[PDB]
Structures are given as C-alpha cells and as structure tokens.
Design a protein around this ligand. Structure first.
Ligand SMILES: Nc1ncnc2c1ncn2[C@@H]1O[C@H](COP(=O)(O)OP(=O)(O)CP(=O)(O)O)[C@@H](O)[C@H]1O
Ligand SMILES: [Mg+2]
Length: 255
C-alpha cells in the first residue's frame, strides 16, 4: 500500500500559495516508471476530460501528498507570455473546454476560486486540464468579480466573471481592469468600466459584455439554463460540444 518512498523525486516543478509541487516517478508496480505531479500540503478527486486527475492520496505526518497527472504542455500564462495574445480560434477552443470543466465542477458544488491562465495546464496533446480547484467554502485581484471585491458573496457567478477576464486577457494580451495598485484595481472592477478593443469580433465583444455584468444575477451563466447560456452564445457557434468532450477537436497549438 501507498507511501512517499514509492515515488522518487525528479525535480521541484514549483510552489504556490498552497504548497510545493514536484515532478515524481512511481517506483512501485503496477504503474512503476510512470511520471506524476506530486503536491504537498475541499473535494479533490474529480473525473472529467478537462479536470486534472487525482491518482493517489495519502498522509505522511505533518503533510498530505497528492499524486496528480503530470501535464507536460505547461500553462496558459506561460504561453500567453510568449505569444502576447491568442487568435480568436485558439481562444474559442481553450475557453470551450474550460466551459465544460467549469460547469462540471459547478455541478459538484465546486467554486473555481483560483481561475486564471496560470491554473490552466496543457497536456502533451494540447487539450487543457483545470488544476487547483476543490474549494466549496472560501487571490489574484485582477481576476476578482465585483461581488467578491465587495465581499457581498462568492458563488458560481463569480467564476463566469473570471472566465470573462481570462477571455479578455487571452484575446488582447491585457487585463480589462487594472490600476496602479491593488486598491485602484479593485475600484476599477467595481465600476465595471470597460473599453472594447476594436480588433475583437462582434461575437467576442458580445460574450464579453454579457460576462462582465456587475450584478451576478444578470451575468451570463446565472441560470436558468446556467452554463448552457454561455455554450449557446453565438461566439461558440462553430463548436460541437459532443466531440469537444470526446477530445475529438484538434487543438490549435501542439507541444
Ligand atoms: N499536474 C501538474 N503538471 C505539470 N505542472 C504542474 C501541475 N500542477 C502544478 N504544476 C506547475 O507547478 C508549478 C507551480 O504550481 P503552483 O500551483 O504552485 O502555482 P501556480 O503557478 O500554478 C500559482 P497558484 O499557487 O495560484 O496555483 C507551476 O509551474 C505549475 O505550472
Ligand atoms: Mg497551479
């Protein structure tokens, strides 16, 4: 049965505001030799095509180990940093898959508080995998929804706002609301004052305005059909969700 000695450390992939992550290799059968991402430290075991998979979970005194998929494709922030902005084609694909994974987490009563390009990883194929979720009861200020800035609540709706921020950042290379310091940024989010860059298609602009509604109740995704509201938006017209789910759609970018 399970034990940290069953995994040899290869490299310290990194560390966040909630632990450290290592690239490990299991030395015990039946998956001996297999590479995994080990995190050392709230529902953590989710099964979905676009949500990172938890393979093992054990507690070594003082800390809890989490063995997850090792995603080789890096993160969206890193790729954004290099490309400075994605084409709408690429954005539509990444956001479509994120929509499915996000809606699924929601069904499980999970709020994706830390939604941002940094937490969206790509596998060797190019399909995304959401990571660092699991919070049911609760960061990067630029991605905070207005009801969250004003501590007026934090529901599934807040995730759709953040989803809109991610779309804007991937399409323009810039954040929609940002000031000189955290305080100015929070104040800018509250006004929900937004200039639409002119190179954005009318479909993209429409989806963005629907997502950036100050009131969580009028924001796209706030029922009745919930997530279906967004999946049925004209921006995703050319998207076949069935095949997307089956990872049938060929990703724009490959690593
Ligand atoms: N399953 C996985 N496969 C490959 N890399 C992973 C991974 N889980 C995390 N990482 C990577 O590990 C390093 C740090 O992850 P980490 O979760 O601590 O911070 P982050 O950059 O993702 C900020 P945050 O703390 O907000 O999540 C990052 O380079 C991240 O891309
Ligand atoms: Mg992460």
């Amino acid at each position: 049965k399970a034990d940290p000695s069953h995994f040899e450390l290869l490299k310290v992939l990194g560390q966040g505001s909630f632990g450290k992550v290592f690239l490990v290799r299991k030395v015990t059968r039946p998956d001996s030799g297999h590479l995994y991402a080990m995190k050392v430290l709230i529902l953590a075991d989710v099964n979905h095509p676009f949500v990172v998979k938890l393979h093992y979970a054990f507690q070594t005194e003082g800390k809890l180990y989490l063995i997850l998929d090792f995603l080789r494709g890096g993160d969206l922030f890193t790729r954004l940093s290099k490309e400075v902005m994605f084409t709408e084609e690429d954005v539509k694909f990444y956001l479509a898959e994120l929509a499915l994974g996000l809606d699924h987490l929601h069904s499980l009563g999970i709020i994706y508080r830390d939604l941002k390009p940094e937490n969206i990883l790509l596998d060797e194929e190019g399909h995304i995998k959401l990571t660092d979720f699991g919070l049911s009861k609760e960061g990067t200020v630029e991605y905070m929804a207005p009801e969250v800035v004003n501590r007026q609540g934090h529901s599934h709706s807040a995730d759709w706002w953040s989803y809109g921020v991610l779309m804007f950042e991937m399409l323009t290379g810039s954040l929609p609301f940002q000031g000189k310091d955290r305080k100015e940024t929070m104040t800018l989010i509250l006004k929900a004052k937004l200039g639409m860059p002119q190179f954005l298609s009318t479909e993209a602009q429409s989806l963005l305005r629907a997502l950036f509604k100050r009131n969580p109740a009028n924001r796209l995704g706030s029922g009745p059909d919930g997530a279906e509201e967004i999946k049925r938006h004209v921006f995703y017209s050319t998207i076949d969700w069935n095949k997307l789910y089956r990872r049938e759609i060929k990703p724009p970018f490959k690593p």
